Ligand code: HEC
């Protein structure tokens with residue numbers, strides 16, 4: 739994926755509720771630093787729903803591709819109220835950005 | 843926005859389900875008094891959906907512009923069954939009316 743395009747998608751669609759940088763603030767949603775390789779619902783210092791804590795999957799490209807297409811379908815009971823990103827290429831670009839931004 | 847045009851839009855498209863005045867009754871939808879500056883899904887005495895309670899954003903001009911364009915896109919799971927207002931000028935006029943009427 740294209741990280742430059744992914745950053746723009748993040749700003750447009752996600753930044754209302756999330757930060758990505760190390761030590762970045764929790765907003766409506768959790769700060770996402772450290773996301774990849776982590777079990778669902780373990781953002782440090784954030785109060786997740788039981789649903790997000792109990793999904794049990796490991797965040798990576800494939801599980802994010804599915805979640806971000808339709809969050810409530812993947813995690814019924816989530817408090818993330820976001821319709822999803824329909825286009826596969828857009829999710830791929832977004833996820834490439836997240837992979838970079840949440841690990842630097 | 844044009845408050846007088848906004849009032850007409852409100853009567854035509856919204857009043858079947860909503861009141862705006864202080865102490866106004868809940869109908870299908872919540873009374874909207876006090877809307878601006880409030881987090882989503884906090885209308886006093888009204889039973890909101892989890893989705894409207896969890897969206898977690900603050901109502902204001904920009905967030906209402908987006909919500910009213912396509913309610914279910916912004917708040918998937920909403921029980922507000924309303925298509926939206928397509929035209930930006932109409933949304934802006936409506937929102938100007940709401941900003942006045944829900945604060946007086
Ligand atoms: C506010 C209306 C949100 C928008 C827009 C987006 N997200 Fe979100 N997200 C939000 C909340 C409230 C939560 C917690 C959900 C819960 O039930 O506890 C989340 C969670 C996520 C997660 C999971 C984090 C984890 O398990 O560690 C991810 C990966 C996530 N959000 C990503 C994300 C992206 C990439 C968005 C733009 C496409 C996005 N969210 C939008 C609230 C909101």
Ligand code: HEC
Pocket residue numbers: 852855856857858859860870871872877881882883884885889890891893894895910919920921922923924927
């Ligand atoms: C009945 C068919 C509706 C019409 C027409 C409109 N709205 Fe509505 N609205 C309705 C319901 C049942 C709800 C509650 C939704 C839920 O899931 O809990 C709402 C909610 C709103 C809100 C949010 C209120 C809040 O979070 O405090 C707003 C701002 C709102 N409605 C505005 C609104 C406007 C301006 C309308 C005309 C364009 C309108 N609604 C139509 C039901 C119905």
